[PDB]
């Protein structure tokens, strides 16, 4: 299912600060940036990497929660739905 995506304004800076660059990326590229972004900003339970702490950062606002599990792609997809600008309908 992994399709191509396009990081908007507030979405580009996210991947950029994570070592990304450009205006085109797939689900695999984005997913890889997400993790790196969180680790770069330090928004997770060092004791449990599987437990992310969105707190109130960019990701926190986009999702609208407090924390989300990494090993559980539940809220991640729900947010990406309208967050990850995908193409091909």
């Amino acid at each position: 299912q992994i399709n191509q995506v396009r990081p908007k304004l507030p979405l580009l800076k996210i991947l950029h600060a994570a070592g990304a660059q450009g205006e085109m990326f797939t689900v695999k590229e984005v997913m890889h940036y997400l993790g790196q972004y969180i680790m770069v900003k330090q928004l997770y339970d060092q004791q449990e990497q599987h437990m992310v702490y969105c707190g109130g950062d960019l990701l926190g606002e986009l999702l609208g929660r407090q924390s989300f599990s990494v090993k559980d792609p539940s809220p991640l997809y729900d947010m990406l739905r309208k967050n990850l600008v995908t193409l091909a309908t």
Binding site: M39, Y44, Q49
Partner: peptide
């Protein structure tokens, strides 16, 4: 040798 987020993160089925 390195795992960290990569260990679990990877799990996330992009598909």
């Amino acid at each position: 040798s390195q795992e960290t987020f990569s260990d679990l993160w990877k799990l996330l089925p992009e598909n």
